[PDB]
Design a protein around this ligand. Structure first.
Ligand code: MMC
Ligand SMILES: [Zn+2]
Length: 258
């Protein structure tokens, strides 16, 4: 398959190879804060990243992914809306060409400068590939980025991007602590949705944190120097790698907080 974010292969085209693009639980969505209902039955989220073991960073021609060892319960997400244990496999971001767009989820139609996705799979399904055959196979923790002060825990990521400029390039990225990417509060919204890139599979319990992290203009500027293209192809800056909000259909967004 041959998909991207431009006019000729972007989100409006995806449904041809991936008909689920027009499905009943697609992501992202707009989070209308006045329709999301506080659910007192939701447990606190448990983010257990102490033993996280990062492996590599990769430019896949769409975004960059930091990949983890998911063989054992090293870095897991539990609680909140989730039954059982979900293992961290990778994180990546979506961002804009300018600060007024870049997020996938929106909050009362507000677009943030970027959005971080920490992707986890349900350990009752044994591996990630099996998990994406299940409606509760994945849990993605989404975190908005706004431009302000630098996020120190992001800097190691920023510092390596020069080495993975183009599609297919990777670099060692062991000993990275994803706890440094989290805001103070774990207040969240949650709803059932999908992967936001092809193959757009409808497997995801979304957990979107209310509090954005702040990153510096210099940090996001370095994201925007990456390339979608491979080396030796015309340069196309990796910006605006976000899918717009999709129809909510018959879904409810729940809030963990009043
Ligand atoms: C069914 Hg994913
Ligand atoms: Zn994503």
């Amino acid at each position: 398959h041959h998909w991207g974010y431009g006019k000729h292969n972007g989100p409006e085209h995806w449904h041809k190879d991936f008909p689920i693009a027009k499905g009943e639980r697609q992501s992202p969505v707009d989070i209308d804060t006045h329709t999301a209902k506080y659910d007192p039955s939701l447990k606190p989220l448990s983010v257990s990243y102490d033993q996280a073991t990062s492996l590599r960073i990769l430019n896949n021609g769409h975004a960059f992914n930091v990949e983890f060892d998911d063989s054992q319960d090293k870095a897991v997400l539990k609680g909140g809306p989730l039954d059982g244990t979900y293992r961290l496999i990778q994180f990546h971001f979506h961002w804009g060409s300018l600060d007024g767009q870049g997020s996938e989820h929106t909050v009362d139609k507000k677009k943030y400068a970027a959005e971080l996705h920490l992707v986890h799979w349900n350990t009752k399904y044994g591996d990630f590939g099996k998990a994406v055959q299940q409606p509760d196979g994945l849990a993605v923790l989404g975190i908005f980025l706004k431009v302000g002060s630098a996020k120190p825990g992001l800097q190691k990521v920023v510092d390596v991007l020069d080495s993975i400029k183009t599609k297919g390039k990777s670099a060692d990225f062991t000993n990275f602590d994803p706890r440094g990417l989290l805001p103070e509060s774990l207040d969240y919204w949650t709803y059932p949705g999908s992967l936001t890139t092809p193959p757009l599979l409808e497997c995801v319990t979304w957990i979107v944190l209310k509090e954005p992290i702040s990153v510096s203009s210099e940090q996001v500027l370095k994201f925007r120097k990456l390339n979608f293209n491979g080396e030796g192809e015309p340069e196309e800056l990796m910006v605006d790698n976000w899918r717009p909000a999709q129809p909510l259909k018959n879904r409810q967004i729940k809030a963990s907080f009043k």
